[PDB]
Every structure is written in C-alpha cells, then in structure tokens.
Amino acid sequence: SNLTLNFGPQHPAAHGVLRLVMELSGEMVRKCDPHIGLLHRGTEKLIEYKTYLQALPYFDRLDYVSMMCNEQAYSLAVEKLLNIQPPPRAQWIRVLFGEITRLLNHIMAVTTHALDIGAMTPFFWMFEEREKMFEFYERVSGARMHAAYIRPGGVHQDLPLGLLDDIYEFSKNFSFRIDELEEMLTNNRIWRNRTVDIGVVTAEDALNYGFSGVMLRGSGIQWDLRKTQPYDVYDQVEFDVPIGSRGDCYDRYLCRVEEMRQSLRIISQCLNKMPPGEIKVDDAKVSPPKRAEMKTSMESLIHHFKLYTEGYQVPPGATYTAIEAPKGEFGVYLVSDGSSRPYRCKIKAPGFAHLAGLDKMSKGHMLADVVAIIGTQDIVFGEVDR
Amino acid sequence: TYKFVNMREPSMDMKSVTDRAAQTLLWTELVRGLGMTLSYLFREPATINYPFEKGPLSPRFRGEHALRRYPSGEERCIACKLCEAVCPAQAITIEAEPRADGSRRTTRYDIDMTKCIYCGFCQEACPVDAIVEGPNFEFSTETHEELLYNKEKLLNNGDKWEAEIAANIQADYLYR
C-alpha cells in the first residue's frame, strides 16, 4: 500500500491553490492526481453578463503574471469578430508591452522555479527589475499589473512623453541581470543535477497531450505562433526561437533564458520603429471619441453615451483566436449572438493541458523531482481554473 | 529562424580534459557563484525607507475614489448613471431626484470598495469629470463596513484631495 499525501494547497511549492494528491512509495512518486478548482471563480459564466468592454478586465486576472498578453488575445478575438483593424501605432505599442510582459513572466517563472529548487537569491535580484517594469505599466495605465490597457480597437491611451527613453534605459541594462542569473544557475553542478533529465517528454507525447510553447520547444519541436501565425506587427521584428534537445527541465530553463534575451532584442526594435499617429481605431461606433470631442460635438456625445451604457454590437459568429503568450498558446473561443454581450467565451489556457500532463511527466521520479517539474511547467492557476 | 541552446560538444584534448578535472576536483564554478554573491554584498541596496520614502507614481495612478465640484462649490455629478452602467463589478448604486431648486442631482451615490476592481472605467465614462480615482492608496480599515462608501464619504474625499486631483487631471487630460 502506497502512502497518500496532500501536497498543497497550503504549501510553498503548491502555488497557493493546488492540492495534489500524491501516492508515494517512500519518496518515489507512484501517482500524481492534481485537484484544481480551488481558484475556480466562474469567469466564463460571469462574462456572459458583461459587455465586451466590461468583460475585458476579467482577462487581466486569468494569467496574472502576463496581463497585457491576455488583453491582447481577447482584443484580437473581438477585433476579428468586429471586422475592424487597430491603428499601426497601437499595434507597435501592443507588441512592445507584450514583450515587456514576457520579460516579467519569464523572470517570475525562472526565479520561482529556482526558489522551489532551493536557490533563493536570484528571486530578489530579478524582482527589482519586475518592479521597474511595473512602473512602466503604471505610467502607461495607472495600474501596476491589471492595466486593462489593451482594448479591442487599439489601446486606451497614448504613451506619456518620456516613457520610451526610460524603457530604453531599462532595456540597455537588463542583459547584465540575465548574465548574473546565468552565472548563478546555468553552469552550477547542483542546479544541473536538479534539472538535467528530469521530466523528459517526447515530441510526439507533447503534441498529443496538448502542450504548447516551451513545453514543445524544449523537446525539439520548431514551433512558435509569433513566427508561424503572426499577429499585430510581429512579422516586422527579427528574433530567434530557442530550441531544446533533451525535453527536460534544464533545456526548458535554458530556452526561457534565451527567450528573455530575444525579447530584449524585439523590444529594441520596437523602440526604434515606433511610428506616429492615433492609438485607437478611428471609428466611434467601436472606440470611444476623445473627451474634448465628446464635450463639443453631438455625435461624439451620443456615441460616448451608447458605448459606455450599451456597448458596441458585435456581428454574430464564432472565432478561435490564439496567441503565443509567455506560458504557451493562449486562446479564446468567442461566440457572439449579435448583441452587445458575448454569448459564450471559452478560455484556453496552456497550463491546463500542461498540468494534465504532470502525472505522465513525473513517472519514475521523486518528491523533489516533482517539485522541479511543477516549476518547469510554469503553471498559474488563475488561468487553469478561470 | 531558430537557435539551439544545448547542442555543443567538449574538446577532448588533454588540456580541456585536465581543466574539466580541475573544475571537478576544485569546484571552480561554485567559487564563481560565491564571488557573484560577494559582489552583490558590497552593492548599495535598493530598499527605500518607507514610510519616510515612497514609491514613484504617475498622474494616471488609480487610487481611492472621490466626487468633485465646480469652482463655485456646485457638485459636478448630474446623476446620468453612466458610471453605474459601465461598472464591471456593479459596485456603484445611484438614486436621484430633482433637487429643491430643480437641479438633476443624486440622493444616493454608493461605491462598494470591496466590490470595486479599481479599473477606472467610471472616470472614463463620466462626462463631467465628477467621479475620479484619486492618488490616495493608504486607506486600510479595521472593519468591513468602513469600506462601503456613501455619497458623504466620497464628497469628503473630493474636498480633502481636490488640490492634488486637479493637478493630476491638468497633467493628464491632454491624453484623454
């Protein structure tokens, strides 16, 4: 008879809300059974009672480590259903802040993974960079993480004067912080002993289990939605896709570090190529008019009133829109019945399938190995439970 | 376009093999990590001396709500209920009637700050800059009830913070 253990929810490596029922023989893990729903808040049903604008902030709170990326996925779905196009400067701002968001997420993932493993120091070094990044969020929107900045039609406000220079100043120094983190972890023999050949997954199994993102690219699969199915202006920036060879924790960590470096590259290109112009679509039946126009012209006041009370009607139809979020493929299946409120909104989170693969990935490992594999899957339960 | 992260090979000459053996027996990379932590030890820390020092914030920062006035002292709010309609959390409750002088004014304006998500949609929707999210963020309480703001509380907040609120609006309104 195996011993049965509750790993979480009140556990340091369980991320607060995950209860993992583990069957063990000694410390060998005979079976993993994740129990979730401890953070199920009924987001998908709540959205059915909101307008599209009212539903937008719910996406900030799904993957609360990558807010603007969720906003962008939802905005792209709604813009596809509306048959409208965001203005170019809005698309460049979207890509820039998406890469800043990827930096935030990869910092959180790598440092918390290292903290589970036992290396506590890099968390403190990198969370000051996260703090500086938070200021960029707050300066653009007034909120440190739940910005609600990216909306269908573009962005809510234009960048304040002086933001680009400060982003450039941060970006010209972040590479040295990456170098220090890699000096602490990459060649360390304890870190390699804790990560090499742990949670090895084959390419075929990764595809069949619904994996996406690094969980694919660590196993050698050459796939990135920004390259294969680009959105906004991602087909105008140069970057490389890091590819692993072993499908284990160490290769996935290396991939995430290199993705941070490539995000720095993309951010540099975005900073140098930002064009002038308007920042939301020039269509007042979708995007609200400027406040000066609202207080001067009758049509602007009417459209402000209607967009903020009823909201825009979306033509009937259904779309599955996916992006390369920092944690993998993040998707929305959005069904519009023609009214101003969405009929159905199914949210596809990469962590759902990734955590469903945890029992397969943990076969033949110990307790500490399972801690490492949980860290390597990059799970946030806001998106898992929704 | 892609790159490999873990596809390198070690040279098998006696120099490289002996260097690897010396690293194995004398723990050179562990000493490198120790040197990195020692270097960080002599750097100046990033800690600020709160509450004597504060974190930087933008004029766009969303804080505690307030209800504003015209320079004559008249309330800006005219009970259009656009903030109530747009509020994603249904945190706003408004009741209105004609005033004694016939003006369109609220009799009830409640914000449940434990329902509020501080998104700032109410202040975007307001046509007369009546409801705002101010700069204050230090308003923790000892009871739940104190966070259910009525109209008197919000008017007091506006009267108390208007000097800062007006300056922040003057700084940001050309972007809105």
Binding site: L161, S171, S175, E182, T186, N187, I267, P276 | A22, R32
Partner: peptide, 29 residues
C-alpha cells in the same frame, strides 16, 4: 497651432542594446 507632439524615438534612433550571453572564461589552467 503648434506642431504635433508625441512620445517618439530620437532622430537617428536609440543607442544599441546588448542581449547576448556574456560569461567570461576568467580562470587559470
């Protein structure tokens, strides 16, 4: 009647930004 004023990159673009790995050898034989 002033010119359009927006947050934009300085003429000639921003200075080059480093991203590649930098782990010096830094050791004896």
């Amino acid at each position: 009647a002033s010119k359009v004023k927006q947050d934009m990159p300085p003429p000639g673009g921003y200075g080059p930004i480093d991203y590649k790995r930098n782990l010096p050898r830094r050791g004896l034989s």
